[PDB]
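User: My advisor, Dr. K., asked me to get a structural model of this assembly before our group meeting. I'm new to this, so sorry if the format is off. These are the inputs:
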Amino acid sequence: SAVKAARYGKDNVRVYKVHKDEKTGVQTVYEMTVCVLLEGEIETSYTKADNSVIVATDSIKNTIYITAKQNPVTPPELFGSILGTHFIEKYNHIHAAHVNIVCHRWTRMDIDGKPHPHSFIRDSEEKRNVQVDVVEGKGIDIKSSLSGLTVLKSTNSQFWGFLRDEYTTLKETWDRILSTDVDATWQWKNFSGLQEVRSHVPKFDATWATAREVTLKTFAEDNSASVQATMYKMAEQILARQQLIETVEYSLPNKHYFEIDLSWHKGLQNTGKNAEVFAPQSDPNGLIKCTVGRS
Amino acid sequence: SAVKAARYGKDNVRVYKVHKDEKTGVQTVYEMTVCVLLEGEIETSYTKADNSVIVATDSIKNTIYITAKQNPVTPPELFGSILGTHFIEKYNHIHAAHVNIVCHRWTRMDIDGKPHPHSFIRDSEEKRNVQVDVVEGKGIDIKSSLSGLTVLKSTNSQFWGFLRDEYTTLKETWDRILSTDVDATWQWKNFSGLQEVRSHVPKFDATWATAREVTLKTFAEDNSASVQATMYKMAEQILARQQLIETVEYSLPNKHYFEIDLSWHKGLQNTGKNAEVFAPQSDPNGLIKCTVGRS
Amino acid sequence: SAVKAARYGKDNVRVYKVHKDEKTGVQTVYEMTVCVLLEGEIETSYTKADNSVIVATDSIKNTIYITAKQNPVTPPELFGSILGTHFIEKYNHIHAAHVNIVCHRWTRMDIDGKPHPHSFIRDSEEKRNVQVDVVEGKGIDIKSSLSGLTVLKSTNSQFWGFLRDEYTTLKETWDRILSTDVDATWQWKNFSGLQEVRSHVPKFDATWATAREVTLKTFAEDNSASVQATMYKMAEQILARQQLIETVEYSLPNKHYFEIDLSWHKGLQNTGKNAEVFAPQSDPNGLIKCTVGRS
Amino acid sequence: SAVKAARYGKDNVRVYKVHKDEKTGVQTVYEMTVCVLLEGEIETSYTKADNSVIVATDSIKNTIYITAKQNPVTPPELFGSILGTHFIEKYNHIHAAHVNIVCHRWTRMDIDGKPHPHSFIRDSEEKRNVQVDVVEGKGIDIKSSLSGLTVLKSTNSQFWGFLRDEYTTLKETWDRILSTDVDATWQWKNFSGLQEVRSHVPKFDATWATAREVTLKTFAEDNSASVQATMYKMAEQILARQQLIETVEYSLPNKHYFEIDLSWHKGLQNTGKNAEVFAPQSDPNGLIKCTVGRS
Ligand SMILES: O=c1[nH]c(=O)c2nn[nH]c2[nH]1
Ligand SMILES: O=c1[nH]c(=O)c2nn[nH]c2[nH]1
Ligand SMILES: O=c1[nH]c(=O)c2nn[nH]c2[nH]1
Ligand SMILES: O=c1[nH]c(=O)c2nn[nH]c2[nH]1
Ligand SMILES: [Ar]
Ligand SMILES: [Ar]
Ligand SMILES: [Ar]
Ligand SMILES: [Ar]
Ligand SMILES: [Ar]
Ligand SMILES: [Ar]
Ligand SMILES: [Ar]
Ligand SMILES: [Ar]
Ligand code: NA
Ligand code: NA
Ligand code: NA
Ligand code: NA
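Assistant: The format is fine. Below is the predicted structure of the whole assembly, which you can bring to the meeting.
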């Protein structure tokens, strides 16, 4: 037998950093969870109990904290690129660093209509994420995402004209609830290395803001024919607004809200145009996925 | 042996209601999880397999949907009181209804600076809750709460002058991070029945808003001597602002953010005044509780 | 305003202890999560920012590890009593210690039919718990429990003869699935102090074993008229088997498994006697509670 | 813009099936969660709002229940193969069916040392899983796994001789705790279709039992040089025992148990040979991955 693939490192590394403006007294906080997994000439750690080739996961943890101390942690695409570049440059026998970052929301509080200098609220479980693959000889592959963006619209969703056969019970509808948890990923053009990433730094926050704005406006404004048709329009618009993105991927649950027939009770009318009270379904759920790229 | 206490019913009943203004086309959505547990002359269902005294949990579920269809679901204090009153009035042998409601946030989207008529975002897992105990002959006991309000301040928290003995390692600090998940409960004056609850309906949204605004402002502005001292200021302000509340309870985790000594690495200075990078601690956590009443 | 009630301390303290028999080389492991909340003359920490009365939660954490080092961690009733007694005895102004322990399962592996000296498996998220309230002048109040015991029987459950009115849709059944997550608590006679707890130490493991064995056997053998009737039989048997218990409490969800009518598809028969395929329901769930004492 | 990739279907489909032996009265239960995602000529559902190409996710849900009614649900490799084959055969324009199954443990209860005919316990959150990719023209690709197998050994784990540089603080150890959640996957030789899967049916349960037995014995018996070296020996042994497997993948967290230095307290000795009480770490964790194949 032989090692066909191996990666190892530290997962679930919680990191906080504060920036303090001494003149203005304004503080800014960043919180993330970091995973770094390394590849390279490490097969003998598995086959021959040779630990000499292991950079200890505990050392990888220390390096994440040291990197946060000595570099900007924003945007996460940059921090991930710096972190991954460190491991392949520092260690000759390490050839790849896979960096996953989840960013947690700390939104500045407004108190009496004025932004507070050092108080923050977690205003959603929505995350901004990166996957940064730094591969020696092959540059830096970045996937940026937002996830856990939970939305609902109470009308202007439809689902009719789907295939009907002996497996089909679902009634066509011209007015239903649509609710999802938005998982949207944009894949960047391959970067040659850390210098190229640094040259595009302003595009990271700008493309995240674009992806979020397009997601929310399209969801709110689309008279939706299907999750499929709505998510495609989001992906189209994002591609049109950032030439350095090669693909946009959506993964969207259809979080079903079922009508409740109450006509068995005193002829209560709670379906179609009279539908007021619904049963949100925890499971099952539709799961709809698309990767959109350029002609 | 004998039944000293019994209650039974349906838990985790997910409910959605929509209001449609056909005039303005503005829709408003409400989503909640409901628990109803009944007490009364039900001992014989346990002792003698006498099901005649059981209002089926399935029927309690149906009753929750029917009540939502025929009544306002807001404020939850009112909806809980109506639901509880229904069971003790409908069924001679049912003497108490315990109604627990978790209200889920559906905040109207702003699209291009304008509130959207029928699109909503879950802005955080913060909940508004009620516990409504409807007890035949003894009226209606309401506890209102907000929970899962997650906040952090980067400075203006201190902890010094605490007891020091052979069990103490904690360093006194004059400048630390304070972060918590706010659980705040206000206990209402006993209400004689549904009529008295109805007569105070506007005070429920008002007092929730007050509790939340006092919580956020006190957290942001208090140069905190301790979790204990800060939470007491929140409770005393809420009591002073609503005479119909008897007590305010706070349950606050101290979600620790530890300094990381990096001086072992190239003399890096990341402690005291130089503290930038911290390790958020998942566990353990301080847990600090107070019930405040009128002196 | 004034403090009506206060308690504070450390929650989510994860503890592991190993016992090593150097003679046999057999090792035994114990893993628990501990919460300690103190009450006493602490009002001034809330009202006057007087930290002198605070035993730091960090110090309570240290005390938990020190107590584990210097005492048996089993049975948890004993460990809880020692820990609670420590705080009210060590500190003149501390008058109550509330100790909550969750015991995690580490079951010794059998390898090739022989128990392994130092390898363990988590055989299920079932927990053994204690709540130990040590109150100066009022002794030691212990509640013992098992929780997260998940069971299902495929037949020999019934539910018929329940109240039927205009809110009822549920069909009577003479043959259904019954599945639950067993939460069972036994309340001990008040103990005068740690000496009285020590004097009953063997009864703690014995009564836990009895409660679990009665639960499993009654569930498997009762041709169940209802959750109510079955849970009462468990409680009365446990009371009859341990005179030092005053009450037995059960809290049991009814985790519904719905029949699926497939007759719309090729006349497929999957209801009543033909029921093979079911839809397990995540929510809602029946919730059935009983406290049983001596008549 | 254009669709580069698309799949859609129903996720989180909870399924129960009972087998009843009428002669012996013995019942056997199977519980799973099923996900089916379809690919094919569906791009126009995204680009042109053409629902005519959609087999409704609700219809996919119905088909999962119907398939369970008309076929064996065990082994899951067979059920997944039948389910996936159905969708590509039934619908001309559907070219791939991706079937993910999680199997939940329902272990027969022993009552008074005799297996009960119809009572079951969830004896762990351990899962047995399959991923079945049925691709028209390209056959059936099966990955089988066990996951959530939580184990600990209190000694006979070591970690020394790893790389030491200016990032390294971790002390070499010749005796530590090792605990993990085992995620082990075996990848089958490509199958030409459902007939070939049916011809290997007995190998599925046998290879799962082998993978589990090898995992537990190797973990218990290996005097471990590293997670890397131990997981490699597991993968080797499994490959040696089933020629129809091409690869074995392990993904193993290192769930750290930290020594607690108590020497600051009355010279208490709780490190190295005196280490009895440990702090289990929730995060971070080592994450170690290997895919092992044949020379
Ligand atoms: O938007 C939808 N897409 C689907 O594919 C689907 N299937 N059922 N309902 C659905 N809704
Ligand atoms: O055992 C049961 N008890 C109940 O009270 C009930 N109500 N619906 N179904 C039920 N099953
Ligand atoms: O605010 C705090 N209160 C406490 O009681 C405490 N104990 N340790 N740290 C603490 N911080
Ligand atoms: O088994 C281990 N493997 C590793 O790679 C490692 N790193 N720190 N500790 C470790 N333990
Ligand atoms: Ar950070
Ligand atoms: Ar959508
Ligand atoms: Ar609602
Ligand atoms: Ar606070
Ligand atoms: Ar322990
Ligand atoms: Ar039961
Ligand atoms: Ar099943
Ligand atoms: Ar291992
Ligand atoms: Na390198
Ligand atoms: Na009544
Ligand atoms: Na005392
Ligand atoms: Na096909």
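One thing worth pointing out at the meeting: The helical segments of chain B are 43-47, 57-70, 76-90, 194-199, 201-221, 227-241.

User: Perfect, thanks a lot.
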